[PDB]
Each structure stands twice: as C-alpha cells, then as structure tokens.
C-alpha cells in the first residue's frame, strides 16, 4: 500500500473524535489539543484557528492526551510520545504489552496508567531537563485495594503524591517512594469522572447516577453531594473567575451549571452535543475567564461565554444565561459526495449522510462553512409547504457545479435520495437556490448535469426521461425520451453541441443539441453505472457493469479503450485534468491508475478502508478521495507534478526507456550525408561574425572616472607553460593527421577565445599553422557536423589572415590546402539549392 504516484497529505474536516481534549495555557493565552484518531490538532483557544497538526500519523489511535506549556503528550497503543510544535521529541515505550489508558504529569513525574491496573512513573534525569525520561518505578493496584483505575490527578501542594481515583475509592500514593499512604471509604456507586477544584484539598467525583461528590482528601470525608437524578455524568469543571460555579456535563448532552455559594441551579444547556455520539465528552472552564469549551464526538467544538449581570448592585443573584461564543465543526456521519468547486483548487463541496452539505477549504481551515438551507419566498405569491418542525434535505447523492455564472443565478444542482426533484443551490451566497427541478414522469433523479455556459441544467430520471431546464429562470425547456430503464449519466460538450447519455439498458445515446436530432445510438454489453466526461479532448469513460471501464471518443462515436483488471464493482473514478490517466476505485478496496495511451494499469494502491469517491483537482495538484468510515476527506499529492513517472504494467506482480518515460531525446546526426548544425545556441554564429561591432555598441557612453594608483596586475591578484594548449593540440593533430581533439576544442570555446586564437595563429614564412588549421577545417566539413561553425571559423580566418595568404598566394602548401577546402565546399552548395526552392515555391503557394 505504498504507491508510486500519490502520497498522502492530510485529512480535512475533522475537529474532534471524542477523546477528551486537553488544554494548555501558554503564557497569558490558551490552546486546545484535540485528537482525531491518529493525529492531534492544536487550536488557538481565543479564535479557534488551526495552529498545528501532528507531524506523522501515529501507529494506532490515541488513547490519552495531556498538555503542558510547550509540550503535548499523546499516549497511543503502548507508548507515550512527547511532541513540541507538532514534531516528535521523545518516544517513551512502557515495558508491557497492555494499552495505556490514562496519563497525568506533575512536576518531575510523568505517570502513565495501563489497563491492567498498573502505574508507570517516569522521572526527569535532572530538573534542568524539560520532560521526563528515566524509568523510576511501577506502582500497581491489587484488586483488594480498589477496582479498576479511572483517573490520575495531582491536587495542589501535595508533595510527591498522586491521587488515583478508582472505580470504588480514591487512593493516595507517595510516588517518590510509593507507599500507599491513604485509602478512601468505598463509594456506593461507580465513580465515572474526577476533577480537582480550585479550593484546596478537594476533588469532585462524578458518579454514574447523577451524583457529584465533593470529597475532601486531607480529612478524607465528603463535604458535599449534589444529585442530578437519571443522568450519566461525564464532565466536571469549576468556574474560577471568582464566581463559584460548576458545570456538570452529562452524557446526554445537557450541560448543567450550579452555583455553589447559593446552592442553586443556574442553568441547563440542552442538546449541545448529540446523545448518540457520546454527549459531552469534555467541558472546561478556561482558567480565569467566563469561557467554557465543550467538545463532543459528533465532530464539533464549541465555546460558550457568560455575560455579566444586568443589575447594578444585586449582582450575582441575577445571573445571565450563558450564550454561545464560537465554534468549528465537520460532518457527524461519513461523507457521501465530494466535488471541487473551483479551478484554483480552493473550496470543496461535500455532502454527508447527516444530510448536511459543507464547503471545505483546503488552504485555511477556518474558511470552511456549512451551506445553509433557508428557503426563499415562493415566487408565485403562495405558500411553500412542509412540516413546520424543520429537518435537513435528503442525502445528496449526485452533484454538479459550474463556475461560469457565479453571482447571477444559481450554479449547483443536487440530487437527493428517494426524492423526485433536484435542488439548485448557490455557491456565492452559500444557500439553497430558488429553484427546484422536477423530473415529470415520477422517477427518482438518478443523475444530473450542468452546461458549460451555466444556463441549462439536465436532470436524468429513473424512468428514462431527460428534462432540461433554464437555471436563470428555473423554467422547463426541453425533454427528450430515448432510454427506457434508468438514466445514469448525462453530459454536454463545451461547444454546447453534442449531448451524451448513458443508461442501464446498456445504451449510450448521442444527441445533437443546437437542433434536436438524434445523432447515434451505441449499444454495450452490460448496464452502465457511471459516466465521466472529459471536455477539452472529447473523451469519456463509462464504468460498465461487468467490472470494466470503457473509454469512448465522443466525436467519432466508437469505443476506443477497454480497461479490464478490476475484480468487484467500480465505485468511482475520474479523468486526469490533462486527459491522460484514470483513477478508479473499486469495492475490492483498491484504487488503480490507468494510462490511456498505453491503455493499461500503471499504478495500484490497496486500501484498508474502501474508497467511495475519487476526484482530481482541476488544477492538477491533488487527488481527494473519500472513504467508507471516518468523517473526513483524504488528500493526496501528485508526484507526477514534481517528477517523472514511468508507465509500465504492474498488476500481475503486485496484486523502452523512451516510451516508458514518454520522452524522446533527439538524435545527434541522422545520416552521414545529412547536414547538421551546432547544438547549443543559435546566436553563436552571429556573435562570432559580428563580435566587434556588438561590443563597440555596448560600451558606456562616457569614460569612467577611476583613480590614479591602480595596482597594475589586478586581473591576477584577485585572491582566493611554454606553448599554449590549443596550439599544442593543433600541432599534434598535424603530426598524427587527426584533428578530432582540435575540433572538440573549437566547438567548445567561447566567442572571445575563438577570435583570440584565430588572431593568434602563426603567420610567417613556413606557414605551418595556417596550413594545419585549414586542414582541420577541411576535415571538419568532411565529418559534416557543425557546418555552421566550420564555415564561421573559415570566415574569421580569411578576415584575420587574408593579407598574408593573399600575398603568399601560389605558395604550394597554401595552394594545396585551399584547393582541398574548395573540394569539399563545392560539393556542399546543394544547401543553397534547397533553400532557394523552398521559399520560391512557399512564397508562391502563400501569395496566390
């Protein structure tokens, strides 16, 4: 399940799963450490932005969390991981084979408590360390001392002592030595929570019936008891602003505030978290403020405040009810359909099976909103009629969007479940749009589509019909009938020209659309389960029923590719943005990437949790999939955006180089007779011809004013043989009659160096050097590469030594060498023949 194209990135749209979150002051300010399965996320408690995210996904889920100033401790399967700023700073493996339930850190000691009633104590090596690492000892709870351990606490001012609240009593250990210095008398109920009060000595214990016992530990006796009847207490927090309040958070969602000075009940808050997914799992008063933060396993996190009184003197007898400050959330239930809204890959719609349609943000996870369903005033002058107690729309099972008219009329169509119309939604205002789109033959909308131009919305039904509606006006325009069984995909071309529809009678019907003809009818084997069209290239992919993908060219109207290799039904799938790949996820828990040129699988991932939607981003950075369990969207990167990706078939093994990297490096020289030029730049020829005039243009217009004492050998003294190398190489070339090495050097000089050398040839009586250079050039034009630069060098030679060879003309050696030069060159005037013909006939063909 390591893959070769996609790699996992993060999982958007999770906030809490129901492990009690932990809080941490940092200076004057607060943060909130929640855990989402195998990660933990850290939120600015003042405004709830996403500061940090755990860096690597822990091996199992996180059992316990605790935080302190800069450090945050998570206790997953067996171990405790100490993290600072997200990155893992210490592992701490506990010498056992039993999971770590609870965890409390106080002073020098970290205290972890397993499930078979044992307490491991890790002590700092020296108190100038910042988190403990020496194993100290291992305190154990024998069954006669107490029941199972429920929580670990450390009350204030208790030197080296640890308050272990078990299911029947409370113990006090002296963790430095470890003698059980105290046992409490057995409570006649089950203890469920514990939490220490901002008065001394006192721990507040919440039992399994509605009974909160304020229990004084120095004396060992109860001082108060408070009865909620018939609730399951699940949270306790002590408001410490100065007003003596208490919030008991039941496991039904009630959050009940008591006033402990006046023995009263201040308030209740009812259904702030859902009864099913756990109720109120943690509910804390931030230390010093009238702010409570509550968090529950329905993937939501909330913040409630206390406004001050209305009354001047009477004060704290008139208590204002606590209102609602701020919150984040996600879906409660796993998601149902996802779709990228816009082509910067910013926003993502996603509908979920608690009937709620969120729009998530990939950049900043505070920009994500839920798209509200508050209907518009009916346009007829009538009454819209539904049950007066409101409930969310049925589960949104198809969804199609266009961004071309955003702001002027609606641009989402959604298709709900067991429901007979579609609803236009908005995306600018984020709200239910004003039109509902019927199907007009009593058939449940099975799939929907939108035109490119954003004017028209097609709604294929389940008795074959196709209805087309204007979206500015919601008003019905056309209605085709070609299928007789259900219609499971609709599509339209970007020229508003050709419409395609695929339906369970194994028919793909092609229509014209400007006029209303029927343009073709293709028949496949099996029912057709999904259509994805791809627009820029006019190709589309039909997930058939016989466990096959069939790609069809929507212009020539015929089946072009047939991708076998799946093994169970195909859930969902998507073309690449560039039309080249298909990702397809299927119910045998695999995701495969297919290449359409080579028509074959080039990648596959086997997933522990079945994937049920798969969607590229349009600007092709990411792949977002969504899974059968777990509320989120899993986001994946794209190594083909950063690298090279080999295309080869693999599925046999798991479950040439030119083509395989689809890139071809051009040849050097095709035939020996065929000409070439120099590979490199093209203005090399022209600078080598006009090197002088160019530099004289470049020189600055005045003269630069310099000093008078200039240390003459500066080109030397920027700090840190006999014959020149080129002339040497030329000479040995003339000795061995092979100038290959010389021509390597002249191809790979620079224009200055070339001109310098060709000026710096010897030019006196036995003209050995001019003869040898001309021989090298002849050999080069014979070898027939670099026609460009050998001609250029000969032109430079005639410029810089035309005088000496014009004078010492009819010397035999120069006569002979120049004749051999003329041999090869008069063979090579055919090039001028070709060019003259090419633009003679080309300009004629163009002008006439």
């Amino acid at each position: 399940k390591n893959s070769k194209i996609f790699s996992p990135f993060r999982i958007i749209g999770n906030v809490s799963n129901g492990v009690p979150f932990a809080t941490g002051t940092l200076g004057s300010t607060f943060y909130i450490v929640t855990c989402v399965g195998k990660t933990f996320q850290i939120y600015d408690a003042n405004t709830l932005h996403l500061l940090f995210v755990s860096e690597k996904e822990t091996p199992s889920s996180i059992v316990a969390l605790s935080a302190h100033f800069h450090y945050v401790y998570a206790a997953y399967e067996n171990k405790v991981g100490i993290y600072k700023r997200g990155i893992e700073e210490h592992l701490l493996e506990l010498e056992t084979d039993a999971n770590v339930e609870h965890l409390c850190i106080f002073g020098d000691y970290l205290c972890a408590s397993t499930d078979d009633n044992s307490i491991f104590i890790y002590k700092k090596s020296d108190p100038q360390d910042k988190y403990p690492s020496e194993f100290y000892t291992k305190l154990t709870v024998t069954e006669i001392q107490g029941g199972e351990i429920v929580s670990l606490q450390h009350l204030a001012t208790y030197l080296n002592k640890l308050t272990v609240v078990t299911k029947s009593n409370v113990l006090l250990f002296n963790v430095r030595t470890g003698k059980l210095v105290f046992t409490s008398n057995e409570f006649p109920d089950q203890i469920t929570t514990a939490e220490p009060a901002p008065v001394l000595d006192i721990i507040a214990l919440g039992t399994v019936t509605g009974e909160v016992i304020m229990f004084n530990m120095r004396k060992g006796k109860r001082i108060r008891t408070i009865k909620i009847p018939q609730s399951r207490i699940s949270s306790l927090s002590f408001r410490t602003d100065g007003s003596s309040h208490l919030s008991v958070g039941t496991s039904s969602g009630d959050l009940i505030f008591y006033d402990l000075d006046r023995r009263s009940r201040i308030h209740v808050l009812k259904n702030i978290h859902r009864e099913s997914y756990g109720g109120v799992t943690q509910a804390t008063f931030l230390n010093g403020q009238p702010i409570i933060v509550t968090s529950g396993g329905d993937n939501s996190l909330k913040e409630y405040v206390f406004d001050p009184s209305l009354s001047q003197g009477s004060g704290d007898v008139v208590v204002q009810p606590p209102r609602y400050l701020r919150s984040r959330g996600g879906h409660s239930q796993p998601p149902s359909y996802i779709a990228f809204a816009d082509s910067q890959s910013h926003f993502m719609l996603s509908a979920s099976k608690d009937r709620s349609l969120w729009s998530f943000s990939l950049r900043k996870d505070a920009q994500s909103q839920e798209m509200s369903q508050r209907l518009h005033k009916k346009q007829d002058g009538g009454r819209v009629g539904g049950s007066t107690i409101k409930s969310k729309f049925p589960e949104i099972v198809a969804l199609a969007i266009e961004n071309a008219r955003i702001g002027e009329w609606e641009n989402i169509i959604t298709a709900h479940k067991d429901e007979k119309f579609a609803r236009t939604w908005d995306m600018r205002n984020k709200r239910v749009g004003r039109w509902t789109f019927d199907t007009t033959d009593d058939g449940f909308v099975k799939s929907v589509a939108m035109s490119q131009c954003g004017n028209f919305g097609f709604i294929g039904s389940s008795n074959g019909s196709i209805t087309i509606y204007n979206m500015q006006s919601g008003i019905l325009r056309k209605k085709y009938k070609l299928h007789k069984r259900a219609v499971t995909g609709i599509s339209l071309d970007g020229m508003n020209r050709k419409m395609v529809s695929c339906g369970l009678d194994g028919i793909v019907g092609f229509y014209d659309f400007n006029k209303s003809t029927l343009l073709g009818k293709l028949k496949l084997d099996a029912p057709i389960t999904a259509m994805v069209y791809h627009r820029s290239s006019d190709l589309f992919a039909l997930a058939l029923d016989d466990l096959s993908i069939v790609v069809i060219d929507a212009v020539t109207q015929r089946v072009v590719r047939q991708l076998w290799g799946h093994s169970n039904r195909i859930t969902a799938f998507d073309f690449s943005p560039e039309g080249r790949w298909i990702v397809s996820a299927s119910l045998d828990s695999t995701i495969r990437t297919w290449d359409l040129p080579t028509g074959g699988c080039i990648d596959g991932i086997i997933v522990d949790n079945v994937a049920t939607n798969v969607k590229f981003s349009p600007n092709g950075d990411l792949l977002a999939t969504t899974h059968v369990t777990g509320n989120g969207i899993c986001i994946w990167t794209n190594r083909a955006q950063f690298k090279t990706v080999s295309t080869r078939t693999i599925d046999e093994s798991e479950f040439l180089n030119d083509i395989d990297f689809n890139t071809y490096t051009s040849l050097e020289q095709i035939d020996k007779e065929l000409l070439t030029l120099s590979i490199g730049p093209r203005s090399k020829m022209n600078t080598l011809l006009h090197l002088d005039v160019i530099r004289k243009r470049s020189k600055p217009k005045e003269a630069p004013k310099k000093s008078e004492k200039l240390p003459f050998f500066l080109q030397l003294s920027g700090e840190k043989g006999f014959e020149s190398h080129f002339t040497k190489q030329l000479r040995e070339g003339s000795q061995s009659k092979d100038y290959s090495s010389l021509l390597a050097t002249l191809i790979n000089f620079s224009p200055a160096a070339v001109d310098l050398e060709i000026r710096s040839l010897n030019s006196f009586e036995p003209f050995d050097e001019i003869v040898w250079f001309i021989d090298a050039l002849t050999q080069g034009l014979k070898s027939n590469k670099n026609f460009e630069l050998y001609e250029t060098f000969m032109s430079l030679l005639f410029k810089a030594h035309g005088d000496v060879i014009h004078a010492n003309n009819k010397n035999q050696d120069i006569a002979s060498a120049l004749q051999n030069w003329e041999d090869v060159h008069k063979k090579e005037d055919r090039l001028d023949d070709l060019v003259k013909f090419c633009m003679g006939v080309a300009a004629f063909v163009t002008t006439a």
Partner: protein, 834 residues
C-alpha cells in the same frame, strides 16, 4: 486548440525587489511586479514563473544547488518554488514586512531578517514529497532595537552578520557551542548600516553606512577584541548609499548611491576602481555573479535593469521597461518580435523568446496610441497625440515620413493598406478619417461623414476596403480606390468602440458599449451573428468606490478585439480583469483568463474587506508618505484629478488593471495582450495535453514502435498522427529514411496535412537537422502544393512558421557559405602581391 497557459511576461525587465544571479553565473532572476522572471543570458531564453503573489515581491533567494527559490512579497508571505519543475511547494507567511532572505551557502538552512528578529529556519528537502508544514524552525534571535536591514552569512556557513537601522551590526553564531565566539556588536555609525560583510578569510569585517562611510574592523591588540582599524569615507554631495555588495574573492565593494552613481571600490585598501552613472534615479539593488565579474544593478523608479562587466567596461545588458504606460502592441509578421507603443513617446521592438528590447525609437513627444506594421517587414507606422503619424523604416531605422494634420489634431487610431501606399488615421477630435498617401507625403483626402469621433479603422486586406467605426453608433464601409468613392453605412445598436476585420475580408466584428460583439457581413450589410458578453466579465471594486462591483459599469465592455488568423476565434479584452476568448461560429466562449491577482492594483478584487472600511472611511486610503524616512519619498506632487496622463506619481491614485490591446500570433498558437504590468503572452503545449485524433483500439505507442521496427513507415507515421503525441511524432519523423521521404510525403492524407506542417514548424525553428527538415519541406510542398493553395486559410499560421524557419535560420547559413566562397575565389585568383 483552446488550452492556453501563461507562457511569458514581456515588456518588463524589473519592477521592485531584489535581483539575483544564478549559481552558475548564467541565468538571472529578477522580480517583475508579483512574479519572478528568469532571463537566460547564454542560451538567450526567457521565462516567467506561473505562480503569482497577492502583492508585489520584495525578496528572493535561490538555492545553491539551483533547486529551490523562496520569494517573499511585502507582508512576509513567502512562497517556496521547486525551481526545476516550476511548481509551487509551500506557502508560508511570516507576519512582518520582511526585508531579506539568504539561503545558507551550504544550502542546509536559510536565514531571514524580519522586523527586528532574525529567524533561522532549515530548508525542506527537494526529494521528499510534499507535506503540511516542512519548515522546521532552528532559532529566532532578538538583538536589535529597530528593524534589521541586511544579512550576510559566512563562507563556511556558521556566522551571520546582521545590520540594522539601530545604527549597528551584530554577529550571531549558529551553534550554541560558539555563542562565545560570536556575541559581540559593532558600533559608531552615524546614520544606518546598509551592509556588513566578511573578509575573504573571515578575519576582517567591513561595515558600510548610509551616511557614506566604510569602517574596517579587525580583532587586534591596542586582552584584545575587535577595534576599528580604519575608517574611509565616500564624499557625495547629498547622495546616500542605497545598496551595497561585496564580492570577497576579488575584494570588490560595489556601492549604489541614490543619485545615479555607483562606484566600485577595492576594499582592504580603499582605492576607487571605477565609477559610473547608471541613470539619474536611485539605484535600488546590486548583486554580482559568482566568479565576480558581471555586476547586476537595478533601479525601480522608471524600472531599469543593467548588468555590467566591470573588467572591460561593457554593458552586457542595459534595458528598461514600462509600468502601466503602454497603449498598444503589434506583432512582427513572424511570431518573433512585438512592438509596444508606450505613453512616453517610445516605441520598442521587443524580442519574444529572450525578453529584451532590440530597438528603441523616441521621435514622438506625447503618448503613442497606435502601431501597425505594413504587409511587409520593413515599415511600421505609428500614431500619437503629437498630432503626427510617423512612418518608420526597420532596416536603416529612420523616419522616412511624418504625415501631419492640417490643423494638428490628436490622432487616436491608425490603419494602413496591404500594399502599403495609403495610410488612414482617425482621431477622437474631429470625426473625419484622414487619408494620406505614403510616397508624396501629402494627404489625399479627408473622408468625412461620421457624426461622432472615430473609434477604430481597419483595412480588409483582400478586397481592400476601409471599414471604420465610430461612437456614432455606426459602421461605414468606404470603398476608396477606383472611380467609386461610394460609402455604405450600418447602424449598430449602440456606441461602437473596437473593430476587427476577418482575415478573409468578408466580415467585421464590432465590440460595442452595451456589451456585444456583433459580427457582420460586408458584401451584404447584414448581421450574421452576435455574441452577448456583459456577464462573463470580472469587474472589481476600487478602493475609492462607493458602489458595488455588480453595479459598477466602469468596465462591462470590451475595448479591444481581434480575430484569429484562421477565422474562428475572437480574443477580446478590455478595461477589466478578464480576457475572454470566444469561438465565432458557435457563439460560445472557450476560456476566460484573469490578467492579475495583485491587490496593489485597483480593479482586482471582487469584494473588498470590511476590516478595512471604518468610520474614517476606507483604510487603504490614508496617506503614509509621512511615515517614509526620506525626503523624496515624502514629496507628493500630484495635479488634482489627472486621470491617466503623465508619470505614475503625477496622480494620487492606484493603477487599474486593464488590457490596453490584444492580438493573436501570426505564426504560433499564442496570443498577447498589453496590460498594466506588461505584455502577457499566453501559449500552448501539445506536449502536455492528450488530445488524440480518430483513435481506435489498436493504436498504442507500442504498436507504432512496432510499425517502425517492421518498416511500414507510412503506417507508423499515420498512427503517430492519430495518437497525437509529440515525442512519438518526433520519433517516427526521424526514423524514416531519405530515400523513402518523397513517397510518404505524396501518400500522406489530407486530414493530417496541417498537423504535419505544424510539427515541422515547431521542430524547425530550434532544431539542427536542416537537411532533414528541408528535404521534408521540399517534398511536402512539392507533392501537395495546390491543395494548400486552395485552402489558404487553415494553413495561414502553419506556412508562416515554415517560412520564418527558412528565412531566419537557414538563410544565414546560405549567406555565410556564399560569402566565404567568393572570398576564396578572389584571394586565389587575383594578382599576387608585389
């Protein structure tokens, strides 16, 4: 056909920020408005990165392996880019207005001076695939008392020198082992500290101050610690330093003063090596290449980039662009040059591939409103509010004529005949189309008859008729040559404001003020289709607006239009944030391009921010020139309400995004649009999109390779053209042999002829096999000439690309070979010397 990516940004060479050389010494990265460009000085090749900041850039640095690039705009919003593959890795915003970033020369960790804090972070790894947060903090140091301003590492990257507006400088170690080695601070400057550098082996330190003074610090006895050994001073009148650099291997100090001078000093002795005037405007930045001998100056006011070769004094390049001040463009009749007509008075011929101005003409005085080439490459005619319309040669570079008015009106559009002997121009002043004759520079006629100023003119280049259009709400088709002098008007619904003639010469598309493009037929007078546009146009809100953008009808129309060279598309662009590309037969649009996302332009956001608007009024609209620390940055000349004329700060308003003028490319698949920040050049890759043609089941890359290896070369080629994959076509193209080229070229199909021509053009301008290409072209024209001649318009661009290849790159090789031949014949036949 309709897949266009941001190819390039032409017409701007430097805007603001910081200029860097590559690791090689070859390429040059320099920040244009909110994008970095890479100008490749050796292989003469340019580009512009695709990613865009939401405000102007202010710091860049490039890794030492040439691999990562960090660019920070103002307000700390860094973007990390993978330089090899040109695709953004990670956005990360440091809150403050950050002032410099330097990678470590090891390339392990990068230091960043933000505010008064020094944050040293570690790089990510370029091999590791992406993640949520890959920047891992190393330290944050906090010595200074006011801003840092500069930042310099060691050569062995473990000590960092920061200079700051504190009037000071500090050394920070990088290990808390070596804190004791580096805890000291430096002192004594009077004004600021604009640089502090190390020596070549780090036993001396230099500190350069805005007051004009260089201190030389050395660890020495009267224990003993870090005295000031020497003080040297520049002596400017009132220039101050604005940017300092030090190449330590050669010990140069290059200092850019605020007056226009720079001086190259030799530092451990302080001798003046050199001194030159760049311009007259403050030099804003300096860099040097690696080996120490291409300097790189940049001056943001007026926007000029300069690269110097200080050994033998020679500008390797001396260039300058136009912010906001361009009124039009027009391509060369070959897709390689582009002409821009600027509001200054300057016409610049800009190369395309390497974005550098070949030539600059400045004979106009006031702004230049229209440019056209002739149907030649020789002359171009240019029209400006001078009152004259001037003709330019482009071989000897001269005004060979200036047609003038008869009372000097302000000319605002230009149009010139195919056989370039008649020039018409029309103004917004007079509503009479003047017609001059080129040779006798007198004016033939004043074609009159509009009632309302002329907004465009054009010449049907086939039938030679002058169709013009005016705010009259009409079009008039004048037929000027040949005893007729008859004229035919057309009423459009409303107030027309740009025009475009088909290539063919039968149709006129006309972009009006209510927001349609109405496409008429000229032989008749009848409207063969319009396309309604007012909606798909993104007008933003200005900060100085008090009305919603959905009502703001500042910009709901297209002031520029252009057909394709095929007859099928119209690009239109306007006074707004979007360029829209329509298809002409189907009347339905293909793509909408957004010119910029740059919140330092006004028309660019759709919805403003309510955190900004308050009781005072808006919040981006206060004055902060008082906050600036410098007299020339406080001085605010602005003649009140001067809507778009004069220099950029001769008005107190922020620029507006607009497309001043749009054209297609006459050779390639591209188009180009002159707008506020330059000329956006948008173009295409078949080598990325999978757009097959006429496929079937049995056509794979494996099958076509098999068809080569058993030698059915025709079939292998047509399978390549059906699959439509660029490497494949190249592969077969070079496989097939020279004897077999003519039969294949005869037997190719008619449908695939245009594609093979397109491929030969794209390979041909930059490849080397000139015999292979020219043999192919000769065979292709030879065996299918007449068909092309019939279908003249599908092949407009394809044959122009081949013809550019022949006259541009083959023809010189012919010239030099022929020159050489005749020189030999002279030298060896002539009379011997003496």
């Amino acid at each position: 056909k309709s897949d266009f990516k941001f190819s390039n940004l032409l017409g701007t060479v430097y805007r603001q920020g910081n200029i860097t050389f590559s690791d090689d010494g070859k390429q040059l990265l320099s920040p244009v408005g909110n994008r970095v460009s890479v100008f490749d000085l050796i292989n003469n090749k340019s580009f512009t990165f695709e990613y865009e900041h939401r405000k102007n850039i202010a710091a860049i640095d490039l890794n030492k392996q040439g691999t990562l690039l960090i660019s920070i705009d103002e307000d700390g919003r860094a973007i990390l880019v993978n330089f090899k593959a040109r695709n953004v890795l990670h956005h990360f915003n440091f809150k403050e207005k950050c002032s410099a970033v330097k990678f470590s020369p090891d390339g392990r960790l990068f230091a960043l001076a933000s505010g008064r804090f020094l944050q040293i972070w570690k790089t990510p790894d370029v091999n590791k695939d992406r993640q949520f947060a890959p920047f891992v903090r190393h330290r944050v140091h906090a010595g200074h008392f006011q801003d840092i301003t500069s930042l310099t590492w060691s050569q062995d990257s473990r000590f960092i020198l920061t200079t700051s507006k504190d009037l000071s400088a500090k050394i920070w170690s990088v290990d808390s082992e070596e804190k004791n080695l580096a805890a000291t601070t430096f002192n004594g400057h009077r004004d600021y500290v604009m640089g502090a550098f190390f020596s070549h082996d780090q036993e001396k330190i230099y500190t350069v101050s805005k007051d004009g003074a260089v201190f030389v610090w050395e660890f020495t006895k009267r224990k003993y610690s870090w005295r000031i050994t020497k003080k040297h001073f520049f002596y400017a009148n009132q220039a101050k330093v604005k940017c300092v650099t030090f190449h330590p291997a050669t010990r140069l100090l290059a200092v850019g003063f605020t007056s226009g001078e720079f001086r190259l000093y030799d530092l451990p002795d302080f001798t003046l090596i050199q001194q030159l005037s760049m311009g007259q405007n403050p030099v804003n930045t300096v860099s040097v290449n690696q080996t120490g001998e291409w300097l790189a100056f940049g001056s943001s006011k007026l926007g000029q980039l300069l690269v110097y070769e200080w050994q033998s004094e020679s500008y390797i390049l001396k260039q300058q662009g136009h912010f906001d001040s361009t009124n039009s463009l027009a391509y060369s009749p070959d897709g390689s040059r582009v002409v821009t007509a600027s509001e200054d008075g300057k016409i610049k011929v800009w190369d395309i591939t390497s974005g550098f101005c070949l030539a600059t003409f400045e004979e106009h005085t006031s702004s230049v409103t229209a440019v056209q080439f002739a149907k030649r490459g020789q002359v171009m005619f240019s029209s400006s509010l001078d009152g004259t319309v001037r003709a330019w040669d482009l071989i000897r570079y001269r005004n060979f004529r200036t047609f003038t008015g008869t009372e000097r009106i302000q000319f605002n559009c230009l149009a010139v005949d195919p056989s370039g002997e008649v020039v018409c121009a029309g103004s917004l002043d007079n509503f009479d189309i003047h017609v001059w004759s080129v040779q006798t520079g007198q004016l033939l006629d004043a074609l009159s008859g509009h009632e309302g100023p002329v907004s465009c003119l054009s010449f049907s280049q086939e039938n030679s008729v002058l169709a013009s259009a005016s705010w009259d709400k009409t079009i008039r088709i004048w037929s000027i040559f040949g005893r007729s002098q008859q004229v035919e008007p057309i009423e459009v619904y409303s107030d027309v404001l740009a025009l475009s003639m088909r290539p063919d010469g039968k149709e006129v598309a006309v972009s009006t003020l209510k927001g349609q493009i109405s496409i008429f037929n000229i032989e008749d007078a009848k409207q063969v289709g319009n396309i309604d546009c007012r909606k798909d146009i993104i007008s933003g809100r200005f900060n100085q607006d008090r009305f919603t953008a959905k009502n703001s009808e500042r910009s709901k129309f297209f002031t520029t239009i252009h057909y394709s060279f095929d007859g099928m598309a119209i690009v239109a662009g306007g006074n707004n944030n979007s360029i829209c590309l329509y298809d002409v037969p189907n009347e339905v649009l293909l793509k909408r391009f957004i010119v910029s996302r740059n919140m330092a332009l006004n028309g660019t956001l759709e919805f403003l921010n309510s955190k900004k608007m308050t009781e005072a009024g808006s919040l981006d609209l206060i004055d902060d020139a008082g906050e600036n620390s410098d007299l020339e940055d406080r001085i605010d000349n602005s003649l009140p309400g001067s809507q778009r004329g004069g220099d950029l700060s001769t008005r107190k308003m922020r620029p507006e995004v607009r497309v001043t003028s749009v054209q297609f490319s006459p050779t390639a698949n591209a188009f180009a649009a002159a707008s506020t920040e330059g000329l956006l050049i948008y173009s295409t890759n078949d080598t990325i999109l999978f757009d097959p043609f006429d496929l079937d089941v049995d056509v794979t890359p494996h099958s076509t390779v098999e068809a080569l290896r058993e030698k059915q070369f025709l079939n292998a080629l047509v399978m390549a053209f059906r699959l439509n994959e660029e490497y494949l076509i190249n592969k077969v193209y070079e496989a097939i042999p020279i004897k077999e080229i003519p039969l294949v070229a005869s037997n190719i199909p008619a449908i695939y002829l245009p594609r093979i021509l397109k491929f030969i053009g794209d390979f041909a301008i930059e490849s080397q096999h000139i015999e292979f290409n020219l043999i192919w072209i000769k065979a292709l024209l030879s065996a299918s000439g007449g068909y092309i001649n019939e279908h003249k318009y599908l092949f407009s661009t394809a044959m122009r690309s081949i013809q550019r290849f022949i006259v541009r790159v083959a023809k010189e090789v012919v010239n030099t070979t022929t020159d050489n031949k005749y020189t030999y014949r002279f030298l060896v036949s002539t009379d011997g010397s003496m």
